[PDB]
Amino acid sequence: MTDAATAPTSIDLRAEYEGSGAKEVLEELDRELIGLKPVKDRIRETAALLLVERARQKLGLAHETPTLHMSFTGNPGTGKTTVALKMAGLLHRLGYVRKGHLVSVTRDDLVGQYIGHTAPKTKEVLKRAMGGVLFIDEAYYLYRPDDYGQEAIEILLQVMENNRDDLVVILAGYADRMENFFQSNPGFRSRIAHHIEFPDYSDEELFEIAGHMLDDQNYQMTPEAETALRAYIGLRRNQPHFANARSIRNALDRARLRQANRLFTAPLDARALSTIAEEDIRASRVFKGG
Amino acid sequence: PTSIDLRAEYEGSGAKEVLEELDRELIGLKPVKDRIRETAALLLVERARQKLGLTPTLHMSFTGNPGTGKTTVALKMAGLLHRLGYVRKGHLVSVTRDDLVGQYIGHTAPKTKEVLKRAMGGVLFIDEAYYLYRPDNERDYGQEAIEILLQVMENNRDDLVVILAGYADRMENFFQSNPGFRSRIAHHIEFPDYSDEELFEIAGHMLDDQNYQMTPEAETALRAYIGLRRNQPHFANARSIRNALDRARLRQANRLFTASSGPLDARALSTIAEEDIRASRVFKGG
C-alpha cells in the first residue's frame, strides 16, 4: 500500500490569474461598466477566491466543488446582468463551469399557467443552462403563495445542491424582496455562496450621464432646466423602482417630448430647437409626488 | 434656411391628414390619440433639427391589452413616418413570431431576413414579440431571430422602423432577458383600455345593432360586470364585451325557453335581464 501525490508542488497565482484569461474578463468588466467601483471591487474579491480555490484544486487539495452560486441584489440599471455576463466569463476561464454562456430568465419562463406545466418548463430551461450560468431576474416572484411556481423553486433548489459542475445560478432583484424570499424559503441561503450588493449612481454621476446623453443628441439646457433636472434626480432616486441611468434617459426622453410639444404649440433657429426649458422638466409628475 | 416654420412642415407633410385619419378611424381613445399627437410633434421637431445639421432613432414599443388600437395606430404611424421623410415606402408589415422562426434547424435566418426585406423602406410590426424568446421550448429557434432583429435595429437603421407590441407585463420581462432593446426603443407608448363609460356605450351600440334592450337593473349589472372584467386577465375590451353579450344572449334565450309562461312578445324577446348578466362566473371570481 502506497500513496503518492502527482500534483505540482507550487503555483504562481499571478501567473495563473494572467494566463487563464481571468485577468482580462475583469478588465472587460471595467470597460463595460460605467464606473461602479464598490461592485467591481467586490467582484475582484470574489475572483480572488475563485482563483485560489482553482489553485487549490490544481495542487490537489480540493474535496468537492466549492458552492459558487450568488445573489445580485439592487435597483435596476446598476450593472447586474452585465456583471453576470462577466461572472459566466470568469467561471468559464477558471474552468468552474463548462461552457461560458449565460441564460437570462424571468418568472414566466419557469412558471406555467395551467396545472402540471411548471416541472418540464423549468427543467427545459435548466437543460439549456447546464454548462453555463442561469440568471433568474426577480426570482422572488416564483414564490407567490397568493400558478405553481412552488415546484420551480424545488427543482431549482435540488439542482443547486446536487450537480454543481454543470450549472451556476445567479438570482437577481431588489434586496428587500430578495430578503423576504430567503426568509420565506430556507435552503437558498445555505446554497448562495456570494451576496453582491449593487448600489446606485450618485446624483453627480447621473447628472454627468444626463449631460452626455444631451450632448450626443445636441441638446442644451437652460440654467433653470439644469436646476430642475438636479432637483428631479434627487426626487426620482427616492421613488419606487429607480432605474439609475435608464430612468434618466426616460426622463430626458419625456422632457424631449414635452419640449417638442411646447414649441410646436407656440420660425425657430437651431438654438430654440435644441434648448430644453424648465417647464419641460418641471411638468413631470415626479414633482407632484407620483 | 436659418430658422424653420414647424406649421409649414406640419401642413406640408400631410401629417395632419394622417392624424385626422386616426381620430376618424379609431373609436375615441383620446388618451392614446393625444400621445400620438405628441409623438408627431417630436417627430416633426427632430426632423426640422436633422434639416439644420444636428440618422435619427425611431423604433418603438406598443404595450397594452387586445383592443386598444395598437395595430390601427401602428398603421397610421407608418403613414406619419412616411410623411415626415423618415421612411421611404410608408407601409406596414405586420408579423407574429410564427413568421420569423422556422421549425427546421437553420430555416429561421433566411425567413427573418426575407421578412425584413419585405419590411424595408417601411415599418415591421412584431405582435407579442416576446414569443420570440422561448427557452421554455427546445427545438424552437427563436433566439436567432432575436439576434438578427437586434443587429438590424442598431446597424441597418435609415431603411427600417420596428414596432414591438403586446401585453406590458410580458414585454418588460422580455427586455430583462433580452437587454439592448430598451436602448433601441425610443418610443414607449402605453395603450390603456377604454373607460367604463365607453365600454358601456359600446355594449349599448352592439345591443342596438342586434335589437336587444337591457332593463335598467341589467344596465347596472353590466357596469358591475365591466369593472370586474377589466381586472381579470386577458381583457380584450370590445371583444370581451361582444363575448359577454353573446353569453348573455345565450342565457336570455335559455331563461325564456325554460320559463314558458305561454306566448311572449317583442319586449320579452328583445330584453336582456339582470339574471342573464349576473349568472356569469365573472361575479363568482373568474
Side-chain angles (χ1 to χ4, degrees), chain A residues 248 250-270:
Chain A
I248 292 311
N250 291 339
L252 290 181
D253 271 0
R254 275 169 284 205
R256 269 183 38 244
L257 178 65
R258 299 196 191 91
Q259 180 262 359
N261 278 279
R262 200 190 79 244
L263 303 169
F264 171 67
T265 294
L268 311 92
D269 51 299

Side-chain angles (χ1 to χ4, degrees), chain A residues 1-5 7-9 11-13 15-33 35-36 38-43 45-52 54-63 65-97 100-106 108-112 116-126 129-143 145 148-157 159-160 163-176 178-188 190 192-203 205-219 221-248 250-270 272-287 289-290:
Chain A
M1 215 303 302
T2 69
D3 194 317
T9 221
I11 185 168
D12 189 285
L13 284 184
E16 260 284 340
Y17 173 61
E18 202 257 293
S20 59
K23 176 174 184 193
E24 203 203 0
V25 185
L26 299 168
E27 310 203 308
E28 285 178 42
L29 175 64
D30 276 292
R31 284 183 298 268
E32 293 170 331
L33 247 215
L36 260 157
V39 165
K40 290 190 217 159
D41 299 320
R42 180 89 188 86
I43 288 302
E45 287 181 21
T46 297
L49 189 68
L50 296 178
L51 165 68
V52 169
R54 170 54 61 244
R56 302 211 327 116
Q57 187 280 127
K58 290 204 167 167
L59 255 49
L61 277 55
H63 180 84
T65 322
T67 342
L68 46 77
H69 309 115
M70 41 204 72
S71 164
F72 298 178
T73 50
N75 282 336
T78 51
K80 287 175 234 136
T81 3
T82 129
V83 160
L85 256 91
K86 306 283 93 189
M87 271 314 297
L90 185 73
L91 289 169
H92 174 65
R93 307 310 285 273
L94 261 10
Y96 274 107
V97 80
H101 72 297
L102 177 89
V103 175
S104 206
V105 153
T106 93
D108 297 326
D109 303 10
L110 307 172
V111 184
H117 267 278
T118 294
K121 233 167 113 185
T122 311
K123 282 165 179 162
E124 227 309 299
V125 170
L126 284 166
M130 315 293 252
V133 174
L134 178 71
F135 186 88
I136 311 163
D137 217 312
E138 292 195 305
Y140 37 79
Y141 287 135
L142 300 172
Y143 175 84
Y148 297 82
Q150 304 281 25
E151 209 196 1
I153 299 154
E154 292 182 8
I155 300 174
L156 217 286
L157 220 161
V159 152
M160 289 177 78
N163 40 25
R164 293 188 290 213
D165 277 308
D166 316 311
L167 184 63
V168 194
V169 184
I170 300 169
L171 308 175
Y174 290 119
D176 57 329
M178 266 286 260
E179 198 40 69
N180 300 320
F181 177 61
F182 293 144
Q183 267 281 31
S184 317
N185 286 279
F188 280 104
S190 336
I192 276 88
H194 293 267
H195 297 265
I196 319 289
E197 293 148 61
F198 286 75
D200 299 350
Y201 285 111
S202 55
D203 295 352
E205 276 165 307
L206 290 164
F207 186 91
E208 251 190 316
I209 283 160
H212 290 333
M213 292 185 167
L214 289 178
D215 289 320
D216 303 334
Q217 212 142 342
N218 267 123
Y219 265 100
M221 235 169 199
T222 82
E224 298 77 7
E226 207 210 282
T227 313
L229 205 222
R230 289 181 171 284
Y232 179 100
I233 301 183
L235 276 155
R236 183 55 258 241
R237 79 105 46 66
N238 300 316
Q239 291 187 242
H241 316 294
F242 178 57
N244 279 248
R246 177 140 80 253
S247 64
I248 292 311
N250 291 339
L252 290 181
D253 271 0
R254 275 169 284 205
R256 269 183 38 244
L257 178 65
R258 299 196 191 91
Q259 180 262 359
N261 278 279
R262 200 190 79 244
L263 303 169
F264 171 67
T265 294
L268 311 92
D269 51 299
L273 292 168
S274 332
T275 285
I276 285 164
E278 194 204 325
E279 312 86 68
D280 311 325
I281 301 166
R282 290 256 178 237
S284 165
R285 294 180 293 166
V286 150
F287 288 103

Side-chain angles (χ1 to χ4, degrees), chain B residues 1-2 4-12 14-16 18-26 28-45 47-49 52-54 56-87 89-102 106 108-116 118-133 135 141-142 144-150 152-154 159-196 198-212 214-238 240-259 262-266 268-280 282-283 285-286:
Chain B
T2 165
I4 277 183
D5 183 8
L6 294 188
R7 261 82 67 199
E9 319 277 328
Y10 184 55
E11 285 196 299
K16 199 187 186 189
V18 186
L19 293 178
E20 285 154 9
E21 274 173 43
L22 182 55
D23 295 347
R24 287 190 258 101
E25 287 150 47
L26 223 210
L29 289 147
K30 177 147 166 49
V32 208
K33 298 191 204 187
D34 286 330
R35 210 159 317 169
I36 301 296
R37 218 99 207 191
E38 288 149 19
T39 322
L42 174 67
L43 284 160
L44 185 79
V45 170
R47 156 109 287 110
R49 299 201 343 116
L52 307 179
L54 290 98
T57 159
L58 295 150
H59 311 105
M60 34 191 88
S61 178
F62 288 178
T63 57
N65 290 328
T68 59
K70 288 171 232 124
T71 69
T72 142
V73 165
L75 188 62
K76 294 290 147 177
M77 263 302 301
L80 204 81
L81 284 187
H82 173 238
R83 315 292 184 281
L84 296 167
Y86 283 102
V87 138
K89 304 154 161 174
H91 76 284
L92 181 80
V93 182
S94 314
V95 180
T96 49
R97 111 97 153 99
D98 295 353
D99 295 291
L100 296 158
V101 187
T108 295
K111 185 151 88 156
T112 286
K113 272 191 74 185
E114 213 288 328
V115 163
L116 285 166
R118 194 194 295 254
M120 251 59 202
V123 182
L124 185 75
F125 180 84
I126 321 182
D127 178 39
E128 290 190 276
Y130 38 81
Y131 283 127
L132 297 157
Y133 198 64
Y141 291 85
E144 298 180 50
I146 298 170
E147 257 204 294
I148 298 161
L149 237 337
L150 223 173
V152 158
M153 291 179 65
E154 318 170 350
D159 63 326
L160 190 56
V161 180
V162 183
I163 304 177
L164 322 175
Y167 297 102
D169 55 338
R170 319 204 74 105
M171 267 292 296
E172 208 50 57
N173 279 12
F174 164 67
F175 289 161
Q176 305 267 196
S177 227
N178 297 256
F181 278 100
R182 275 155 176 159
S183 53
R184 291 320 171 160
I185 277 92
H187 316 256
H188 300 267
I189 315 274
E190 274 143 39
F191 284 64
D193 306 303
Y194 277 94
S195 63
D196 290 357
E198 294 180 311
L199 284 168
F200 181 83
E201 284 197 323
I202 295 162
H205 289 317
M206 292 185 173
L207 285 185
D208 306 337
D209 298 10
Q210 277 190 299
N211 287 341
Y212 289 85
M214 277 176 178
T215 64
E217 279 75 16
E219 283 181 322
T220 89
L222 215 225
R223 286 188 214 270
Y225 180 98
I226 299 157
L228 293 185
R229 183 63 192 90
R230 42 137 15 100
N231 292 309
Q232 279 148 116
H234 313 309
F235 176 58
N237 291 255
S240 301
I241 304 307
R242 304 183 238 274
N243 289 332
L245 301 187
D246 293 356
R247 288 182 275 243
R249 263 169 48 251
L250 176 77
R251 292 199 201 93
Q252 177 258 18
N254 282 274
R255 205 195 75 236
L256 297 176
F257 178 56
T258 309
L264 22 67
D265 68 337
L269 287 127
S270 279
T271 297
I272 297 174
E274 201 187 341
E275 302 84 296
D276 312 320
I277 307 163
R278 287 197 174 284
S280 164
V282 165
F283 292 107

